[PDB]
Amino acid sequence: DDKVKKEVGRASWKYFHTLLARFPDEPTPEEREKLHTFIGLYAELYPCGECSYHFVKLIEKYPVQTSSRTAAAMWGCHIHNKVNEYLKKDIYDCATILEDYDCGCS
Amino acid sequence: DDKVKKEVGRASWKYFHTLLARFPDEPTPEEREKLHTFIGLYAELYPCGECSYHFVKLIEKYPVQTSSRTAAAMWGCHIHNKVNEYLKKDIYDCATILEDYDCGCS
Ligand SMILES: Cc1cc2nc3c(=O)[nH]c(=O)nc-3n(C[C@H](O)[C@H](O)[C@H](O)COP(=O)(O)OP(=O)(O)OC[C@H]3O[C@@H](n4cnc5c(N)ncnc54)[C@H](O)[C@@H]3O)c2cc1C
Ligand SMILES: Cc1cc2nc3c(=O)[nH]c(=O)nc-3n(C[C@H](O)[C@H](O)[C@H](O)COP(=O)(O)OP(=O)(O)OC[C@H]3O[C@@H](n4cnc5c(N)ncnc54)[C@H](O)[C@@H]3O)c2cc1C
Fold this sequence. Notes:
The structure is a homodimer.
Chain A (H helix, E strand, L loop, with lengths): L1 H20 L7 H17 L3 H13 L7 H18 L20
The complex binds flavin-adenine dinucleotide (2 copies).
């Protein structure tokens, strides 16, 4: 129900923004191509009917910015804010988008 | 640092298993290929170099089963258990894999 959608959404966003924060600063044409294809599949395969419906249209209306890490993670913050806007939720400050989602990795 | 990686990991698995449990029972050939492609990028783009390296090897050794929701969900559980075994963590019983992740299919 509403519960599941909320719990899954939170986990997904956490993974989503962390993934983008790791995208390279100088992506190659192939990497830019891969992120583009991943996003399309991410949207199409998202585990919630209405969510996928809305999200597929959003990414086509505002395609993922793949020129760089900053552009991609920022696009992620902007796209998530489009969902927030849609759900009447607060808009998140994107000023520390990379720092907010460190991979905690090497 | 390691606590962040673990948090990112938990969030990713939650999303991952739910996605597999929401895949169609009767997928079309195109949906099957999209899932195959998605999993390849998911492994390739995971937010941790070492994790990604090992996971890519795993999905190649154990390619995703896309014939149905159940096959895909079962595959996801086994693949996660391969990571568990790798990190010397306990094995997870896959007997109720669909239910555990709100397949909305019971
Ligand atoms: C691709 C996708 C599409 C979705 N579509 C819908 C839908 O159509 N209908 C519906 O009911 N639900 C939808 N959801 C669910 C929804 O977006 C929320 O995940 C959910 O309702 C839980 O809300 P929340 O308040 O806990 O914050 P979320 O929106 O889950 O919160 C993520 C957390 O990340 C942070 N955050 C918030 N905004 C941003 C941002 N802009 N950039 C970076 N971090 C941010 C904050 O710390 C916050 O607590 C979707 C989820 C995903 C992942
Ligand atoms: C693609 C991917 C690759 C990863 N690779 C590495 C790596 O190489 N090295 C490293 O240090 N970390 C890696 N991680 C992180 C790691 O697997 C864990 O997420 C993390 O250490 C935290 O573990 P946890 O014990 O809290 O449970 P996780 O293993 O995070 O648990 C999620 C939870 O899901 C359930 N669960 C457990 N096993 C299964 C299963 N088999 N099927 C369905 N549900 C299950 C349980 O409820 C458990 O609480 C990876 C994560 C992902 C998503």
